[PDB]
Amino acid sequence: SLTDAKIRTLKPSDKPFKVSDSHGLYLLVKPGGSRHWYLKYRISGKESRIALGAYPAISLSDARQQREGIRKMLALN
Amino acid sequence: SLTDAKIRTLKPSDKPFKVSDSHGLYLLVKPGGSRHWYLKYRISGKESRIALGAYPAISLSDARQQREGIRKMLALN
Ligand code: NA
Ligand code: NA
């Protein structure tokens, strides 16, 4: 799981990487400095992702709420 | 659009009613006192809704973030 302090301690490296919160939500951190939220989802054997916005404009708390909304929608079905 | 003050000023009446924020999000207020968030959505001519949680456990700000996540998911397609 993430905390804001854990996120802020992260630094861009020489390769993109993801840090997971839970339930499909992750932050993608790129070498150029981008930090962007994504939610991954799987439907009939195919996995895709949707962008939820840049951090810190979208906070960890915000991203989590977006995830909770999306999970309720994905529940169908 | 809603504000928390506008919501708190609402009172249960003798009939259920909805107050809209925007973009499908509304609060359903029932005579027995329930205040619950829903998001309505329309796909190929059919409209349904999903519950997003009880107010005030789910704040207006939270409901809005849930809506923003869901709208990104509905965008497909
Ligand atoms: Na990186
Ligand atoms: Na009412």
Side-chain angles (χ1 to χ4, degrees), chain A residues 1-10 12-41 43-77, chain B residues 1-10 12-41 43-77:
Chain A
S1 63
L2 298 179
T3 59
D4 196 61
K6 285 176 193 174
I7 293 167
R8 291 182 185 271
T9 301
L10 297 178
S13 64
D14 69 354
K15 193 167 161 70
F17 63 87
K18 306 175 179 76
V19 289
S20 178
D21 187 41
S22 58
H23 296 289
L25 176 65
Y26 66 85
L27 187 73
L28 176 63
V29 181
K30 295 175 76 158
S34 180
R35 294 174 294 184
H36 209 93
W37 293 111
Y38 293 88
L39 184 72
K40 49 181 188 175
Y41 61 101
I43 300 179
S44 40
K46 296 182 181 65
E47 183 189 293
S48 289
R49 74 190 181 170
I50 54 162
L52 304 182
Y55 175 90
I58 296 302
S59 69
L60 171 59
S61 294
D62 298 331
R64 287 174 168 161
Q65 290 295 144
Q66 289 192 61
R67 173 191 65 209
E68 291 314 291
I70 292 162
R71 288 173 68 201
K72 297 170 189 177
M73 174 265 171
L74 289 168
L76 334 163
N77 168 207
Chain B
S1 63
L2 298 179
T3 59
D4 196 61
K6 285 176 193 174
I7 293 167
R8 291 182 185 271
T9 301
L10 297 178
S13 64
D14 69 354
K15 193 167 161 70
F17 63 87
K18 306 175 179 76
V19 289
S20 178
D21 187 41
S22 58
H23 296 289
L25 176 65
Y26 66 85
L27 187 73
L28 176 63
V29 181
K30 295 175 76 158
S34 180
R35 294 174 294 184
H36 209 93
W37 293 111
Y38 293 88
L39 184 72
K40 49 181 188 175
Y41 61 101
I43 300 179
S44 40
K46 296 182 181 65
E47 183 189 293
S48 289
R49 74 190 181 170
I50 54 162
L52 304 182
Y55 175 90
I58 296 302
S59 69
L60 171 59
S61 294
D62 298 331
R64 287 174 168 161
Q65 290 295 144
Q66 289 192 61
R67 173 191 65 209
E68 291 314 291
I70 292 162
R71 288 173 68 201
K72 297 170 189 177
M73 174 265 171
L74 289 168
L76 334 163
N77 168 207

